Design a protein around this ligand. Structure first.
Ligand code: HEM
Length: 145
């Protein structure tokens, strides 16, 4: 049910993955500035220059498309989430807590741009919790506790 509650507001996100993706990463870097250093192409870019950066927006679109692909499944995790855990633990070297940060940013952006109501906000937090727990289990399998 919580996947359905999020999908019923995904239309504005999928309609403009680049614009919404840029909103998400811009807001992540503003509200959680330590996350920006984890993206070495973007680390050091002054905040004023982030909203208009096409590479940032394109990266955000990639994130959102992947999340759409993980909603649109409702728990077919594996062939999709295991590679994501593998790359984020071992290539990008992202501490797991950062996923909670981007998930709260996404909740805020969907509240503002996608009509996600209070119950929808809770549903999305639930869904992101499922995703993050699976990512963490895979991090642990790789030796990243
Ligand atoms: C559920 C949330 C997230 C999703 C769906 C996601 C998705 C992706 C995807 C699909 C890619 C490109 C393919 C790959 O390397 O795996 C990627 C790359 C990357 N992600 Fe994420 N990501 C998420 C969260 C994060 C967070 C929280 C951070 C850091 C705070 C992060 C940092 C990176 C970095 C540094 C790259 C490589 C950028 C480059 O190669 O140009 N990701 N992510």
């Amino acid at each position: 049910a919580d996947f359905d509650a999020v999908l019923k507001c995904w239309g504005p996100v999928e309609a403009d993955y680049t614009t919404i993706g840029g909103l998400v990463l811009t807001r992540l870097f503003k509200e959680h500035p330590e996350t920006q250093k984890l993206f070495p192409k973007f680390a050091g870019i002054a905040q004023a220059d982030i909203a208009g950066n096409a590479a940032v927006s394109a990266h955000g679109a990639t994130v959102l498309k992947k999340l759409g692909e993980l909603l649109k499944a409702k728990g077919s995790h594996a062939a999709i989430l295991k590679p994501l855990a593998n790359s984020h633990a071992t290539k990008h070297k992202i501490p797991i807590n950062n996923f909670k940060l981007i998930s709260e940013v996404l909740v805020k952006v969907m509240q503002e741009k996608a009509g996600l109501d209070a119950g929808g906000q809770t549903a999305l937090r639930n869904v992101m919790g499922i995703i993050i727990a699976d990512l963490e289990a895979n991090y642990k399998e790789l030796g990243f506790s």
